[PDB]
Amino acid sequence: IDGYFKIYSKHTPINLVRDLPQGFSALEPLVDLPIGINITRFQTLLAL
Amino acid sequence: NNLDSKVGGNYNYRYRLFRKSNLKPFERDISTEIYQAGSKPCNGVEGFN
Ligand SMILES: *[C@@H]1O[C@H](CO)[C@@H](O[C@@H]2O[C@H](CO)[C@@H](O)[C@H](O)[C@H]2NC(C)=O)[C@H](O)[C@H]1NC(C)=O
């Protein structure tokens, strides 16, 4: 937002089958950074 | 002036003179590229309008 950057997150255990779960849970803020750049795209990074 | 100014003029200081529109609040623009003032596009280093 307008010269600011933020993260929020949560983690939980569930035993479903193959999809995102039928319940309610909420994210706390983690970190904030004054990055101030145009941002238009993103990509996730995963190991082998 | 008693720090910055030079008898030839201190041209190490510059500003933006041409832009498509007014920039955003606390939004800076680091561009050197040629501005097109004419209806004609402009390509390469210089041209009319
Ligand atoms: C941040 O960058 C984007 C992309 O370079 C800018 O949006 C572009 O603006 C020009 C001029 O209107 C258009 O020709 C492009 O098609 C736009 N592209 C996209 C992806 O939107 C945007 O204006 C920039 N933001 C700031 C504040 O400078």
Curated annotation (Swiss-Prot), chain A:
Protein name: Spike protein S1
Glycosylation sites: N38
Function, as annotated: Attaches the virion to the cell membrane by interacting with host receptor, initiating the infection. The major receptor is host ACE2. When S2/S2' has been cleaved, binding to the receptor triggers direct fusion at the cell membrane. When S2/S2' has not been cleaved, binding to the receptor results in internalization of the virus by endocytosis using host TFRC and GRM2 and leading to fusion of the virion membrane with the host endosomal membrane. Alternatively, may use NRP1/NRP2 and integrin as entry receptors.
Biological classification of the source: Viruses, Riboviria, Orthornavirae, Pisuviricota, Pisoniviricetes
Designated gene of the protein: S
Organism: Severe acute respiratory syndrome coronavirus 2
Complex and partners: Binds to host ACE2. RBD also interacts with the N-linked glycan on 'Asn-90' of ACE2. Cleavage of S generates a polybasic C-terminal sequence on S1 that binds to host Neuropilin-1 (NRP1) and Neuropilin-2 (NRP2) receptors. Interacts with host integrin alpha-5/beta-1 (ITGA5:ITGB1) and with ACE2 in complex with integrin alpha-5/beta-1 (ITGA5:ITGB1). May interact via cytoplasmic c-terminus with M protein. May interact (via N-terminus) with host bilirubin and biliverdin, thereby preventing antibody binding to the SARS-CoV-2 spike NTD via an allosteric mechanism.
